[PDB]
Every structure is written in structure tokens, then in C-alpha cells.
Amino acid sequence: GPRV
Amino acid sequence: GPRV
Amino acid sequence: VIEKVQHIQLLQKNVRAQLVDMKRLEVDIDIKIRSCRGSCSRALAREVDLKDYEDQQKQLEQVIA
Amino acid sequence: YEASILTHDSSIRYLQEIYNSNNQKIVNLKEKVAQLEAQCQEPCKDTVQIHDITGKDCQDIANKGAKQSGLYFIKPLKANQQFLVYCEIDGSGNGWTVFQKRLDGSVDFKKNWIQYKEGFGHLSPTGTTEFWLGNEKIHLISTQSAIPYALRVELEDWNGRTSTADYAMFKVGPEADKYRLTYAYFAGGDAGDAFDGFDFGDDPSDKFFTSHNGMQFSTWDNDNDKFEGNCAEQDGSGWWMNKCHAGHLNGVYYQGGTYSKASTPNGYDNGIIWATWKTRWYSMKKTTMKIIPFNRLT
Amino acid sequence: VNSNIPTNLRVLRSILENLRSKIQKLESDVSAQMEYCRTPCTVSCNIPVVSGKECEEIIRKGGETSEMYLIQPDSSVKPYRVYCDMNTENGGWTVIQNRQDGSVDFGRKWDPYKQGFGNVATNTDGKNYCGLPGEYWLGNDKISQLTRMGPTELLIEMEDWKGDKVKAHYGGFTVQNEANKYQISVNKYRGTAGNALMDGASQLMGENRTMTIHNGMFFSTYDRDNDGWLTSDPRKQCSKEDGGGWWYNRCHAANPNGRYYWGGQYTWDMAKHGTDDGVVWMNWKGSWYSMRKMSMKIRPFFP
Ligand SMILES: *[C@@H]1O[C@H](CO[C@@H]2O[C@@H](C)[C@@H](O)[C@@H](O)[C@@H]2O)[C@@H](O[C@@H]2O[C@H](CO)[C@@H](O)[C@H](O)[C@H]2NC(C)=O)[C@H](O)[C@H]1NC(C)=O
Ligand SMILES: [Ca+2]
Ligand SMILES: [Ca+2]
Secondary structure: OOOO | OOOO | OOHHHHHHHHHHHHHHHHHHHHHHHHHHHHHHHHOOOOOEOOOOOOOOOHHHHHHHHHHHHHHHO | OOOOOOHHHHHHHHHHHHHHHHHHHHHHHHHHHHHHHOOOOOOOEEOOOOOOOOEOOHHHHHHOOOOOOEEEEEOOOOOOOOEEEEEEEOOOOOEEEEEEEEOOOOOOOOOOHHHHHHOEEEEOOOOOOOEEOOHHHHHHHHOOOOOOEEEEEEEEOOOOOEEEEEEEOOEEOOOOOOOOEEOOEEEEOOOOOOOOOOOOOOOOOHHHHOOOOOOOOEEOOEOOOOOOOOHHHHOOOOEOOOOOOOEOOOOEOOOOOEOOHHHOOOOOOOEOOEOOOOOOOEOOOEEEEEEEEHHHOO | OOOHHHHHHHHHHHHHHHHHHHHHHHHHHHHHHHHHOOOEOEEOOOEEOOOEOOHHHHHHOOOOOOOEEEEOOOOOOOOEEEEEEOOHHHOOEEEEEEEOOOOOOOOOOHHHHHHOEEOOEEOOOOOOOOOEEOOEEOOHHHHHHHHOOOOEEEEEEEEOOOOOEEEEEEEEEEEOOHHHOOOEEEEEEEEOOOOHHHHOOOOOOOHHHHOOOOOOOOOEEOOEOOOOOOOOOOOOOHHHHOOOOEOOOOOOOEEOOOOOOOOOEOOOOOOOOOOOOOOEEHHHHEOOEOOOEEEEEEEEOOO
């Protein structure tokens, strides 16, 4: 996925 | 071994 | 020194020759057989028994005296 | 009792008749040992054999008449040493050079930079082992002076179905530029363009920070990702990381497909995922990345 | 006086009848082995992706497990299978000789010694790759070329039948090509086994000890006499007598390509020609012990  |  | 003691003399050294020769052939075959484990489908599971050869070898010598 | 003196002569020549008998047998047996010897010189037959034909790549090889899938030495124009590969060759004369494989999780894909550069895993003639060919090789195979190349990705779920996704003008740069992934365009396929990025739904920027085109290669010990943390460390792989990934074919092998957030230590999804085909919590059963000159892909 | 003649005819009869039987047990077994030999043993060694010039390049390229690898020392020659040892002393060790059971014949002619023989590796069981080594001689042509690529060190390891193990390290190791009768040269010894190769048999004396030095020797095999034993008599050649090819002098302090005696202890009336053939390293166990494991491993040398 992505990240914060 | 040797040999004489 | 009689005709037949001569005949018994030669056998005593013919069998000592053979007891060393067999003992050898025995070892030889065990190694050669094991060395087929690396190329043949299987190698016969076996064990050498030197005791049998070494027993007779002492027994022979006793009776050569 | 003690045998007779006249018995002694019959008895004496009987022993000679068996000593010589023995002797003769001993000579015949030695001779038979000798014959057993010549039977025990060859080694065990190794079933895995490397094919004779060689070329610049699997397509070159296949054009030289090669008919069947197996292990081949290839040597791209700009390479020093030749190297072994798996070539998949179909009925139409297509020779795919396979550079990545997953299927049983037998191989641990958490490898360092050198390891992804040189390669790890094993090649098998039946094409049934997990491997990473090595970046350096991949770079060489895909950058031979003016030969447009194509990558196919092949997925398989834990339910039978499989899906492909193609990419024209595929290319991996030198170590200089951290084995950069570039392609002209998505060439079609019912797995979906996961290198374009994926709208994950955790942020408006996702679609960009998960695209892979242009990404440099990253391992835990060589961080080259667009994220101030460590994609390859956390997600425990070597991949073309952004911030971090929409597709993750070098991910951790999850048996069954379904895995959860609690399955992982660092909270993030580290499995073999391809976001356009399945959820970021479904890890593929089979994974294969292979390349072929573009002019060959119809 | 007369008890002796029949006492012989009793015992001599017994022994001969005993042997007749021993012959039959042996005829049986050879019959059997021949039958099994109508079909080969097999392996399936999936080749590791990572390759290199030799096992040290591979270890540095990230190949950390001990298995069979495909090396290519030079572009001129085609790649070949070798077993790399990655665990022993920082790894990167290329096995050129290996003994562990009696699976492979080592009493071979010149050509097989030149080409290499035996099994490089077998399947680890429950696995598709071959992570155990076979008994093999790599081959002189290959061994020569490897050592002349640059400073090459030699590691000889060995184990007795009770589990104790020792080693005979050599800092420099070189083998010349076929035109030079694969002449060996070693230097810079350390280790626990005893310097059999440079010094000769630790237990012999003066000129006797000297005729067992291997350093500088030429490689000989039963069909090619290159030992330091100058005679007119065909049967008086070390490779004929000590069984299998080696850098024999007159004849040896160390015989790693000898015949594999099961058990360890063996004696002169057990030996084919009475000479101490078999996996001998006099400097450790003497002339009549025959190692359970024996291996020669090479690696490039860094001071
Ligand atoms: C070199 O060795 C020979 C032979 O000795 C052999 O090895 C010994 C360790 C021991 O095991 C012997 O039984 C082996 O035969 C030595 O032979 C000498 O021969 C002469 C001639 O008959 C004899 O008079 C000597 O007594 C023998 N040696 C002795 C004193 O036992 C020879 O002396 C050795 N010479 C060297 C260079 O050390
Ligand atoms: Ca980073
Ligand atoms: Ca000679």
C-alpha cells in the first residue's frame, strides 16, 4: 500500500 | 609409506 | 622326507597362500562393492568378517608345528 | 579312532583336488570382480541438464530452432560472462526469458542489495522453483543496443484463476542508476496496470506514491525509495519501491492468500500483492515475471 | 610322531571346505552387485541462480549455503558443477577432492583423473537442490587452471572413525598443466594434522622420510608412471601399489585418493599388494589407519  |  | 610328507608340506604352504589370498579378495570385494554405491542403483548391504579368516590362520600355524 | 595309514594317500590327493578346485574358482572370481569394476565408473545420472543451444537471449535461442522449455546459457551483447536462465518456449516460437518466479514460498526473498544484483534461488528444467535472476542480468538482457523489450507478469490466485499484465519498452537501468524500472506504456491484461499506481483510498496522493514506473530498486540495506522510512526493510523484500507499492511480486509468501494486518510485524502489507487484481490483503500463489523482444508480442 | 599326519588331514580339510564356502558367499555377492548395476543411481540438482569464477566470488556475491554451484573460472572454458563449502572458515571454499563413504572408485587411469570423476553432489532428501557433496575428484585440468588464476590456498580436512578431526592448511598451492605432468607445489603450512606434503612422514628418518615428500612431485596414475621410484619392474609403481592417482614420491606420506577401508584399522595382509594403500595421513594416525572423511578444498589467498 502507501504510507502516512 | 616409503620404499627402499 | 618321505614321498607323502612332501605332499603334505606343499599343501601347508598352498593353504597359507590361499588364506592370505582369500582374506585379501574378501577385503577387495567389500571395497569394490561399496564403490558401486556411487554409480549403481544400490550397493549390496554387507559386512566383512576377518575373525573367521584370522581364526583359521592361527589354527593353521599351530598344526604346521 | 584314527584313520588308516593306507587311507592317507587317498585322503592326501583329495585335498589337492579341492585346493586346485578352490584356486580355479578364485581366478574366475577375480576375473568377475574385474568385470564389475567397469560397471561402476560412471557417476549417478543427474536428471537436470543444460541445453546445448545458446544466444543473446531466449528469443534468439528459440529462433535458432530451440523447441522446448528449459535451462539455457545466454549472453547479451554487452555482458562479460555468460549466465544460465530459464527459457519458456511455446508453440509459436516465442522464447521468454523468465527473471522472477514464486510458487511455494520455498525461497526467502528478504535479500540484500548484492543478493538482488547477482541473483538468488535455483533454476530448474521443469520451471518449478522460486528465483530472482538478478538485477544486473535483467539490465543486460533488456538494454541490448536498440532492441525494444516487453515484460509479462503472470499471477495465480489460490482458486485456479490466472491473470496477465503486459508492459511495452520494458527496461532496467545500470547499477549506476539503482536498477531503475522504465516502460513506455501498459500493454493490456486482465490483472490491471498496477505499475500506474492504485487509488487505495487512504489518501488522494496514493495513486502516485504507489506507481512504479521510474522507481529505483530498493533493499533494506540500500534505501532508494520516495519515503523517509524504509519500504524494503518494513515490507521485507527487494522491489522498485515508491511510498511504497501497488504491486509487490517479491513480497512475503502468505499461504492461502488471505492475510491480515496482525499477520505482519510493522503493520504494513508485505505480501505478494498486485492491487489492480486483488486486495492488498490477498497474496498470490504463483508469480512469474518474464521478458521477450517487443516485436514478438504480436 | 604319527598323530601329526592325521591331525593335519583333519584341519587342512576343514579350512579348505571353509574357504570353498567363502568363495561361494563371494560369487553370490558379485552376482548381485552386477544385477543392481544394470541401472544407475540418480540425482536431481537444480542449479543455483548465483554463479561465479569460483566459490569465493560466489560467497561475496551472496551465496551463503553449502551446496553445488555452477562456476566458470574462465570464458574460454564452459561452466561446470562444483561443490562450494560456505560454512568452514569464512567459506568460499571450492572442493577439489572429497571422501566420506566408499561410493566412488579412485583407482582410475590418467584420462579420468585429468577429466574428473565421481559425483559432485547428491540430493539432501526432501529437497530439489543438491546440498550434500558426493565423492569426487574435480579433475587435474580444472584444478590446475584454478590455482594458476592467482595465489591459491589449500585446505585439507579429515576425520577418523571415532569422530575426531584435524586439518592441514597450506598458504600457497599450485598445480601445473598436463605438459608438466600436473606438477604440484605447496608452501606456508599451518594446522593440526601434520605437514605430510612438505616434510614427509613425521615418523620416518633422514633419507627414508625424504622419499615421502610430495612437494614438487609429478602426478602419476596406474597407467602413467611419474613417481620418484626409479625401477625396471612394471609392478613396482606407486599408483599400481597404493591404488589410485596422486602426486606420489617413493611412495607417500599422505594418500587421500587411496582405497576406502571401512572401520579404520587395516593391515598389510588385507592390502591388495601389501603396501599401505587407503586414505592415509601418516603424520596423524600412521600408515595403517584409513580416514572416514578426507577432503581437499581451495580458495584464493588474501595476506
Ligand atoms: C631406512 O629404513 C630402512 C627400513 O626400515 C623400515 O622402517 C623402520 C622404521 C622399521 O619399521 C623397519 O622394520 C623397516 O624395514 C632401514 O633398514 C636398515 O637395513 C639394514 C640392512 O639390512 C639393516 O642392517 C638395518 O638394521 C636397518 N635399519 C635398522 C637399524 O633397523 C634403514 O636403516 C633406514 N635408514 C634411514 C635413512 O633411516
Ligand atoms: Ca527511504
Ligand atoms: Ca617410477
